[PDB]
């Protein structure tokens, strides 16, 4: 029941942006940690971004940095990746999970982590 659900993929020209969504159910992100991965053809699960609990800190992979942005709405349960500039190997599923170790949050803190993650939501730049 606690669950995490991505959307906003979709088919687009390089140059050009989406924004992913991942919204939370049967639970709230409120005072939880979220990043964002992907798997890009052939390759091995890249992380992508993370926002931290508060919002104040923010991570972006080197090759992201710049073009997208991680941010979140708590009222609506949610966090965004807006990508901007996209490039072709930008191309991938990307899913998001919520509360794991060292991901915008203390590597090791009091709290079990719920460890949360998603689904999937698809890019493809042309």
């Known amino acids: 029941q606690v669950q995490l659900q991505e959307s906003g993929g979709g088919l687009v020209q390089a140059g050009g942006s989406l924004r992913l969504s991942c919204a939370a159910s049967g639970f709230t992100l409120d005072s939880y940690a979220i990043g964002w991965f992907r798997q890009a053809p052939g390759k091995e699960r890249e992380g992508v971004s993370c926002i931290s609990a508060s919002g104040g800190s923010t991570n972006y992979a080197d090759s992201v940095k710049g073009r997208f942005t991680i941010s979140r709405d708590n009222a609506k349960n949610t966090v965004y990746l807006q990508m901007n500039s996209l490039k072709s190997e930008d191309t991938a599923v990307y899913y998001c999970?919520?509360?794991?170790?060292?991901?915008?949050?203390?590597?090791?803190?009091?709290?079990?982590?719920?460890?949360?993650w998603g689904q999937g939501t698809q890019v493809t730049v042309s």
């Open positions: 999970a919520a509360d794991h170790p060292g991901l915008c949050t203390s590597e090791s803190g009091r709290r079990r982590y719920l460890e949360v």
